[PDB]
């Protein structure tokens, strides 16, 4: 008897293209499929209707694509649902799916980070859908005073605007100082509010910049030299500062800031630079001489005030969050699946960082004990470690340590995680393991995805293909078939990586077989794969001249803009003195991808406690005509 199945994201978004993957397993001939979407539970209105035919030519696998529109039934903050119902010939397969009201992204750029009373705020709102492509929709824009009360409201459509909405607001001369806010949201998605802040303050631009950096990104609690810091002072036009610096340190304990008055030093700034040390004794004396170990996990901060020898200008800068550590590194398992397949390799994706959170390059890591597998971190701080697992339900405890040649054992980082065994259907011992090389992956490259099969050999030969699905930006980007021929425990899919895969993707794969008496068994796995962040296209601004010298005031100059054909480019020029006073809330591509990554509907690095958990944790529903399906997803946000 044929088993029909449908796979959708387990959070559906309105006004955005969603793909439903349809398969007729062990069916013959052409299978017509009608897919409809109704509101739950009323099922009165038809929200979407699409049809297709599954043929032997396409191996009885296809899809429909459709777009649930913004309706009156949607938008007291209760979760909304739709009923997705696929009819294969006459057999109905139904799944109730959670709906997200949020319909895209808004990004807000202000011309500057800080403003005086009596000046104008220039700002733009970029209106994109979930694929980051420009859309024309209606947005509400608010400007909020520091008390959080909207002073100005606007309603604009970005139709025929290429997703760019230029706006402005005049700051009155009599105004409250502090953090102002621009808030924007799509008209159809009022729950999702996008924001940026700008400061309103009385200031003049400084003539130079002060940079305060410790010689290491941490303070090692047994370093008897104390914490050494370099003070750099340079005029905005690049020349070195001559002057005097006042440097004072403090220790941060949670939210408590404790100044160290005995650390205050006055030093000369000669040729733009100076050095100052917080001594270990002054640090420990300053917190009433506990043992030094009690400071581990706290952080240090440094304030530097630089005065020009003329005394005609002054600039203060602070560096905070310098961790007090016993180790230069820390190990994270956030990218490693928390489930393993007993009897199969278990792959660890170890993330090593410096104490500031930046990735650590060329750090040796190794699994404690067993086969002594040892790897080196890439430029993205990631290293892959593979261990064999025995066929037992015994939970897997794994400890990873750094093996940095230059460090003592006490200074090496360590971290332990636990992985639980994937639970099989009917204690069948049938599994699937996906594997990938974890080197840094670029668009245009090919990624070999390994499909590894664990199945007893009497049943083995029945598995002739795997279905795989690629999730990206919370949609189904791609779905296909990976063939298999009997006796092949390992087959390889050559996955060509394109800019469509930025910033990361999930590959979900499953096979299905028939136990005798008709019982259907579904076996699934999944992996998460990072793609190096870049723009989908590209954009560069550079000089269109030869840099024989720096320009003089009023000089004409040619700007060279290199980008995608037909792109709309919007510009701003800002005096870097502005950023000496405030450098927060600037738009960057790294921030855009971070927003995209927070919004992922997949929630784990891969695998799951069972086939249903594999699908759900990667952001997918699975529903079959013979009853195999994912559980309801409880919340719009990922568990914690």
């Amino acid at each position: 008897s044929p088993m029909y199945s449908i796979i959708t994201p387990n959070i559906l978004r309105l006004e955005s293209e969603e793909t439903m993957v349809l398969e007729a397993h062990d069916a013959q001939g052409d299978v017509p499929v009608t897919v409809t979407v109704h509101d739950f539970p009323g099922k009165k209105l038809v929200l979407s209707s699409e049809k297709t035919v599954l043929t032997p030519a396409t191996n009885h696998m296809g899809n429909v694509t459709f777009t649930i529109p913004a309706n009156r039934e949607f938008k007291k903050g209760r979760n909304k649902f739709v009923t997705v119902q696929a009819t294969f010939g006459t057999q109905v397969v139904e799944k109730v799916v959670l709906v997200s009201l949020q319909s895209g992204y808004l990004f807000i750029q202000t011309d500057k980070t800080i403003y005086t009373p009596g000046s104008t705020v220039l700002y733009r709102i970029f209106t994109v859908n979930h694929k980051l492509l420009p859309v024309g929709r209606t947005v509400m824009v608010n400007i909020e005073n520091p008390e959080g009360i909207p002073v100005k409201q606007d309603s604009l459509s970005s139709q025929n605007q290429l997703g760019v909405l230029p706006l402005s607001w005049d700051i009155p001369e009599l105004v409250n100082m502090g953090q102002w806010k621009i808030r924007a949201y799509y008209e159809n998605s009022p729950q999702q509010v996008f924001s940026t802040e700008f400061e309103v303050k009385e200031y003049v631009l400084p003539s130079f910049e002060v940079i305060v950096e410790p010689t290491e990104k941490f303070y090692y609690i047994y370093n008897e030299k104390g914490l050494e810091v370099t003070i750099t002072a340079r005029f905005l036009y690049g020349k070195k500062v001559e002057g005097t610096a006042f440097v004072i340190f403090g220790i941060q304990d949670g939210e408590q800031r404790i100044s160290l008055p005995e650390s205050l030093k006055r030093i000369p700034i000669e040729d733009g630079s100076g050095e100052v040390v917080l001594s270990r004794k002054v640090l420990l004396d300053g917190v009433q001489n506990p043992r030094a170990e009690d400071l581990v996990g706290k952080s240090l901060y440094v304030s530097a005030t630089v005065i020009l020898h003329s005394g005609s200008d002054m600039v203060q800068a602070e560096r905070s969050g310098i961790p007090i550590v016993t180790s230069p590194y820390q190990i994270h398992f956030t990218k490693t699946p928390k489930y393993f397949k007993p009897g199969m390799p278990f792959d660890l994706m170890v993330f090593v960082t410096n104490p500031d959170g930046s990735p650590a390059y060329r750090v040796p890591v190794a699994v404690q004990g067993e086969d002594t597998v040892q790897s080196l971190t890439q430029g993205d701080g990631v290293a892959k470690l593979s261990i064999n697992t025995h066929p037992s339900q015994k939970p897997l405890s794994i400890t990873v340590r750094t093996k940095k040649q230059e460090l003592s054992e006490a200074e090496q980082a360590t971290r332990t995680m636990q992985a639980l065994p994937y639970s099989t259907v009917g204690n069948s011992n049938n599994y699937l393991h996906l594997s990938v090389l974890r080197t840094e992956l670029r668009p245009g490259e090919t990624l070999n995805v390994n499909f590894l099969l664990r199945m007893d050999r009497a049943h083995e030969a029945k598995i002739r293909y795997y279905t795989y699905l690629i999730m990206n930006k919370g949609r189904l980007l791609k779905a296909g078939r990976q063939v298999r021929e009997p006796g092949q425990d390992l087959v390889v899919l050559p996955l060509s990586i394109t800019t469509d895969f930025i910033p990361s993707f999930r590959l979900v794969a499953y096979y299905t077989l028939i136990g005798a008496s008709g019982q259907r068994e579904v076996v699934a796995d999944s992996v998460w794969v990072d793609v190096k962040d870049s723009c989908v296209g590209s954009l560069v601004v550079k000089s269109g001249q030869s840099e024989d010298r720096q320009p003089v005031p009023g000089q004409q100059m040619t700007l060279k803009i290199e980008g995608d054909h037909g792109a709309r480019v919007v510009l701003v020029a800002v005096d870097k003195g502005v950023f000496v006073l405030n450098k927060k809330n600037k738009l960057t591509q790294s921030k855009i991808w971070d927003v995209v990554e927070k919004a992922d509907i997949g929630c784990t690095p891969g695998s799951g406690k069972d086939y249903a958990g594999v699908f759900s944790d990667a952001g997918l529903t699975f529903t079959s005509s013979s009853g195999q399906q994912t559980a309801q997803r409880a919340e719009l946000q990922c568990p914690q």
Binding site: P345, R454, M455, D456, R457, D489
Partner: peptide, 14 residues
């Protein structure tokens, strides 16, 4: 090295 515990296949554990 890396292998799978089962009776069949090119990558089975020995």
């Amino acid at each position: 090295x890396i292998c799978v515990w089962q009776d069949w296949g090119a990558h089975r554990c020995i």
